[PDB]
Design an enzyme around this catalytic site. Structure first.
Site, short mmCIF file in Angstrom:
data_model
loop_
_atom_site.label_atom_id
_atom_site.label_comp_id
_atom_site.label_asym_id
_atom_site.label_seq_id
_atom_site.Cartn_x
_atom_site.Cartn_y
_atom_site.Cartn_z
N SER A 45 4.12 3.06 8.00
CA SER A 45 3.76 1.95 7.13
C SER A 45 4.95 1.53 6.27
CB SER A 45 2.59 2.37 6.23
OG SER A 45 1.40 2.40 6.99
N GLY A 46 5.07 0.22 6.05
CA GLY A 46 6.17 -0.34 5.30
C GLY A 46 7.41 -0.65 6.12
N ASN A 100 17.84 12.04 11.28
CA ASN A 100 16.98 13.19 11.03
C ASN A 100 16.73 13.28 9.53
OD1 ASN A 100 15.96 15.86 10.56
ND2 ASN A 100 16.59 16.39 12.65
N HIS A 158 0.81 -1.21 0.00
CA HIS A 158 0.00 0.00 0.00
C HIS A 158 0.85 1.27 0.00
CE1 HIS A 158 0.24 0.29 4.56
NE2 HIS A 158 0.10 1.58 4.28
N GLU A 210 19.60 7.11 7.48
CA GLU A 210 18.94 8.31 7.99
C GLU A 210 18.74 8.25 9.49
OE1 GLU A 210 18.40 11.04 6.74
OE2 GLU A 210 17.59 11.03 4.70
N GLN A 219 0.33 6.25 11.23
CA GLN A 219 0.48 6.74 9.87
C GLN A 219 1.89 7.27 9.64
OE1 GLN A 219 -2.60 8.19 11.51
NE2 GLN A 219 -3.74 6.41 10.72
N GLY A 220 2.49 6.89 8.52
CA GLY A 220 3.85 7.26 8.23
C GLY A 220 4.88 6.24 8.64
N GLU A 229 24.12 9.30 5.20
CA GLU A 229 23.05 8.98 4.27
C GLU A 229 23.58 8.37 2.98
OE1 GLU A 229 23.47 12.08 5.58
OE2 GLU A 229 21.61 12.69 6.58
N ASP A 237 1.96 2.17 19.93
CA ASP A 237 1.57 1.59 18.65
C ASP A 237 2.44 2.23 17.58
OD1 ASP A 237 0.13 0.03 16.82
OD2 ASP A 237 -1.73 1.18 17.06
N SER A 238 2.43 1.62 16.39
CA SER A 238 2.86 2.33 15.20
C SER A 238 1.69 3.18 14.69
CB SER A 238 3.39 1.35 14.15
OG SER A 238 2.45 0.33 13.85
N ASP A 296 0.06 -7.52 1.99
CA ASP A 296 0.55 -6.13 1.94
C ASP A 296 2.08 -6.12 2.01
OD1 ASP A 296 0.61 -3.38 1.83
OD2 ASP A 296 -0.09 -3.07 3.86
N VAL A 322 17.69 16.83 7.87
CA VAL A 322 19.04 17.38 8.00
C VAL A 322 20.00 16.36 7.41
CG1 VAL A 322 20.83 18.19 9.62
CG2 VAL A 322 18.39 18.65 10.09
CA CA Z 1 19.43 12.98 7.35
#
Ligand code: CA
Length: 223
Positions: A177-178, A54, A40, A52, A174-175, A62, A171-172, A84, A57
């Protein structure tokens, strides 16, 4: 993540952020060129961001790598969120080190009561919204299938499990996900869905990765 803690920079080295001009989903690095996420979360034009902490920044660890191919599970059902799961191939291999590392696939399914680590940059509030810039972590147990089906009558398939707290508060969200659910150093789940976040008697529901190891390995071997 609601009710979690600040992980610490690069303490979850397999965690990825999927970016389409902005963070929109998590994912897990499973070897130097492949990422697992939720189906999804599919869209075109994904850049995978590794190393990653932050996400707003540039901190120095990265790696930004574009996706060359996305493969949604052949039986994904967007109405029920059954199956899913999606695979993303990177255009070039990541450079693996102590802060960017792959997570192993499981050889067996994890049992209820196992403690797992869930992580992500998702919403931190159960009402209203606040999105963190740094990675958040949550330790949570896998719930029994009976508790899971009792919380979500008619909605839990054999490809899903519940993890979290029936009391709510952690909980986990929105955002997230995955993103990964890791137990005993193996990827056992993918953040998939839930009713609200951190609500009483509504734990998180996760894709059951151990059911897909055959499909993952076959797909990676021919793509
Ligand atoms: Ca960063």
């Amino acid at each position: 993540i609601v009710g979690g803690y600040t992980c610490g920079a690069n303490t979850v080295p397999y965690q990825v952020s999927l970016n389409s001009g902005y963070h929109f989903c998590g994912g897990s690095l499973i070897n130097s060129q492949w990422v697992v996420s939720a189906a999804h979360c599919y869209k075109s034009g994904i850049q995978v961001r590794l190393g990653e902490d932050n996400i707003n920044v540039v901190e120095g660890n990265e790696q930004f790598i574009s996706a060359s191919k996305s493969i949604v599970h052949p039986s994904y059902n967007s109405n029920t969120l059954n199956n899913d799961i999606m695979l993303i191939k990177l255009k070039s291999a990541a450079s693996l080190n102590s802060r960017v590392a792959s997570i192993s696939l499981p050889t067996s399914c994890a049992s209820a009561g196992t403690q797992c680590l869930i992580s992500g940059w998702g919403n931190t509030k159960s009402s209203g919204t606040s999105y963190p810039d740094v990675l958040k972590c949550l330790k949570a147990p896998i719930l029994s299938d009976s508790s899971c089906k009792s919380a979500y009558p008619g909605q839990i398939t054999s490809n899903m499990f519940c993890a979290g707290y029936l009391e709510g508060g952690k909980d986990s969200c929105q955002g997230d996900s995955g993103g990964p659910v890791v137990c005993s150093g193996k990827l056992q789940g993918i953040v998939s869905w839930g009713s609200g976040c951190a609500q009483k008697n509504k734990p998180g529901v996760y894709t059951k990765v151990c059911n897909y190891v055959s499909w993952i390995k076959q797909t990676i071997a021919s793509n």
